A paper describes a structure:
The T5 family of viruses are tailed bacteriophages characterized by a long non-contractile tail. The bacteriophage [name] is closely related to the paradigmal T5 phage, though it recognizes a different receptor (BtuB) and features highly divergent lateral tail fibers (LTF). We present a composite map determined by electron cryo-microscopy (cryo-EM) at resolutions ranging between 2.9 Å to 4.9 Å of the entire T5-like phage particle [name], and atomic models comprising its core structural proteins. Our results provide a complete atomic structure of a T5-like phage, provide insights into the process of DNA ejection as well as a structural basis for the design of engineered phages and future mechanistic studies.
The [name] (PrtP) forms a dodecameric ring, which replaces one of the MCP pentamers of the capsid. The PrtP ring interacts directly with a ring of [name] (HCP), also dodecameric. At the HCP-TCP interface level, there is a steep reduction in the diameter of the density attributed to the DNA, suggesting that DNA is locked in the PrtP-HCP lumen through interactions with the DI of the HCP ring even before attachment of the tail to packed viral heads. Since the negatively charged DNA should experience significant repulsive force when passing through this region of the portal complex, the dynamic nature of the HCP DI β-hairpins may contribute towards preventing premature DNA release. Second, we found that the neck tunnel at the HCP-TCP interface is open in the pre-ejection DNA state and remains open after DNA release.
Author numbering:
A (entry chain D): 11 to 378
B (entry chain E): 103 to 378
C (entry chain C): 103 to 203
D (entry chain B): 204 to 304
E (entry chain C): 305 to 378
Write the structure that this text describes.
């Protein structure tokens, strides 16, 4: 097998969580806008990729002998009698993103999402994984779970078994930004705004002094009153003063922008999608976002499903309305390939989502 | 790939009909006196024979010796910068909590009843702020003097912005990913930059790996990108390329079907060159 | 669409040959122990059977639990900003009336 | 430093330290509310200025020069360190390959 | 469209029919009269799409002349 396994087993005999700060993470997602938007964009975008089921490899596996039509119906249409496909996918992608792991039970003809925060993985001494422990209260056998994990480098060990949370790296910034914003507000409420200072060495009757202050205040403001010249007598002195601390020095604007970029970068969504730009910007950036961020995630998932079932399994984007190519280019592509006798007609109908037409010529190559 | 990047080495066991990853942090390589490598030692506790391991290493120049056997970690060169940047960011925060913001200073040589003085401070504070209160003129009597002051140290002088940007560039550069991929730019920027990133950074790594596998197995082995959805070429150009080569009798039809991922068609003419 | 955006959920009754909107602020969802959902409770005063409601929910991550059943309101994340802006605008006005020229 | 206060009298050290901590926690907007300050018995506020400032450490071009020197010694164009536009990027690879390697 | 996909996926779960939203009534989206004509014409003349399919896409009633439901090869 692998002689080293008995030693590797002791380097990390049981998985451990990586999403520390779970409460403050749920607060942040529930309260901070840019996190909520970027996470919802990723989840809602990944959930709508269709899956295609390919050919079958001859190798033996756990989920033996399942007919293709069933697997297709389970993946594309109905995971189990009680839960839809979209809710199932969004749950799995939520676990995969936030915790860094995802687990799915299988029960002959049912797939069930199993919450990643309660599972635990126990290493085998000879094979890869011995059993999965749920809530310390039930053990799942290895051939009854589908397991997915993100990358993991932990405590200076490259980590099998465990998965790094993606979102865990972002909380540090969400705190600092919130602090700045609160300070930016509260400086205004702690503020102090004086219009004039008058001064004497005499002592003045307090009640009359207060009345005089209210008279000056209402009279001099242009909104309330008319008067503007002021004549002081008996030695009241006007004291020149200056604003000893000013709002001008709170030029936060670039620092908070940095934190927004960090958050936006951790998910890996281009800023053009947060802004909207020009056409030349916008149309390629969607393909950037889809291919670089989402498709590696789905490749992790599909490679785990092909390992478990043994069928070739891979995701199809061409249902996605966002990606769907331009009606002009596709027509010249398909037409030119069809007329030059590289591709049969019905293959083009298929690529245009059209049913094949049974006229034999439509399945013939035309040479000229 | 994690081991190859972080540690700088990777090891794979082979067992007749199995390949197993072996953690790079626990392996050690012992030099032979006549051949290249004598044996591999794992955790000082088991020795793997040389013909049972596949070995990959990144470049290595160590202590002034060019180094066989050993591999330099890539990520090890980045930590110096991650520390300094974090320090600046923490300082940037903590200056605010250590801050001190005064609105007014009033002064006397007399001594004043402390309790009434505190009450007066709270009255002035609540009255003068426009959010809380209305009053704005202030009349001082009995000789309380207003003392002019200035902000002796200001947030304006913490213009960190370019320095931290430098550190981000350093980190971004150590992996070798263009900034256009961190931003997203225009089309003319974006589409070539993906090919830059793939060909310059990734393909040399995979060439290291595949050259080690071809050495071990003896088959020609090389990586194919054309499954990668990011790279996959434009539907327009590819059609005119293939069509023009096919019609001018350089390439047979089924070769084009193959390049379009299509199954070859058994009509003999599809495997014939057409001259005109 | 108003219910789906503001509350984060939407419910529709079905009655053989009728669909009726049911206000999302008054519905409540009770989890089943074996199936997904046991029954829907309206105003604590009537229970709808599961096969008589169409249920829609937006995403939900709550108190550090990814949440089945519940839905996050979209508009709830915006109020914090609407307050601060209004404050600034009022201050911007009132400085003029408190002015002195 | 946030503030400097000064006297010719001598003050009880323990109470002086307590007073410093009270002022520090009270005046910062994050910790506390108060903002006006009333000094009595002759404590004077001393105006001061930042005698040496971070603003004068404008290193940015000098270090950029050193990066260019290093980048130049191998002979790799900066467009390969940045990534630019297509017209920049595609010829620069041929420049790097043909001239240096 | 993601919102409407949430709704329609719930309705397809409940009824079991395929259900999906059509935008092409929306006057804001409705494509340019020039491009659509060259798209449809080129597909029709090259014998990929039958005539009545084009009439349908232009919101026109199908015409019962048999040829209008024939592909034209050349």
């Amino acid at each position: 097998l692998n002689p080293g396994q008995r030693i590797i087993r002791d380097m990390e005999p049981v998985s451990h969580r990586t999403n520390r700060k779970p409460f403050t993470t749920g607060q942040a997602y529930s309260k901070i806008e840019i996190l909520n938007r970027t996470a919802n964009m990723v989840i809602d975008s990944a959930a709508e990729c269709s899956y295609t089921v390919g050919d079958k490899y001859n190798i033996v596996t756990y989920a033996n002998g399942v007919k293709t039509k069933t697997l297709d119906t389970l993946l594309n249409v109905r995971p189990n009698p009680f839960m839809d496909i979209s809710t199932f996918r969004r749950l799995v992608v939520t676990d995969l993103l936030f915790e860094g792991c995802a687990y799915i039970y299988w029960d002959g003809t049912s797939l069930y999402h199993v919450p990643a925060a309660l599972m635990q993985v126990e290493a085998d001494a000879n094979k890869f994984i011995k059993k999965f422990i749920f809530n310390n209260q039930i053990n799942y056998r290895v051939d009854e779970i589908i397991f997915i994990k993100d990358n993991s480098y932990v405590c200076g060990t490259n980590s099998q078994i465990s998965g790094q949370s993606r979102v865990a790296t972002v909380i540090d910034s969400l705190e600092k930004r919130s602090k700045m914003l609160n300070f930016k507000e509260k400086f205004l409420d702690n503020g102090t705004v004086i219009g004039l200072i008058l001064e004497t060495d005499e002592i003045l009757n307090k009640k009359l002094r207060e009345r005089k202050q209210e008279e000056l205040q209402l009279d001099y403001n242009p909104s309330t009153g008319q008067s503007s010249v002021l004549i002081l007598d008996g030695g009241m002195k006007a004291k020149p003063y200056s604003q000893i601390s000013s709002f001008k020095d709170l030029d936060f604007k670039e620092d908070i922008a940095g934190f927004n970029k960090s958050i936006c970068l951790a998910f890996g969504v281009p800023q053009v999608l947060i802004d909207g730009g020009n056409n030349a910007n916008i149309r390629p950036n969607i393909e950037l976002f889809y291919y670089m961020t989402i498709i590696p995630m789905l490749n992790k998932l599909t490679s785990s499903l092909t390992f478990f079932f043994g069928y070739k399994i891979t995701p199809n984007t061409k249902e996605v309305a966002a990606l769907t190519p331009d009606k002009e280019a596709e027509a010249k592509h398909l037409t030119s390939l069809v007329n030059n006798g590289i591709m049969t007609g019905n293959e083009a109908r298929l690529e245009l989502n059209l049913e094949p037409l049974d006229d034999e010529q439509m399945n013939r190559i035309r040479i000229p």
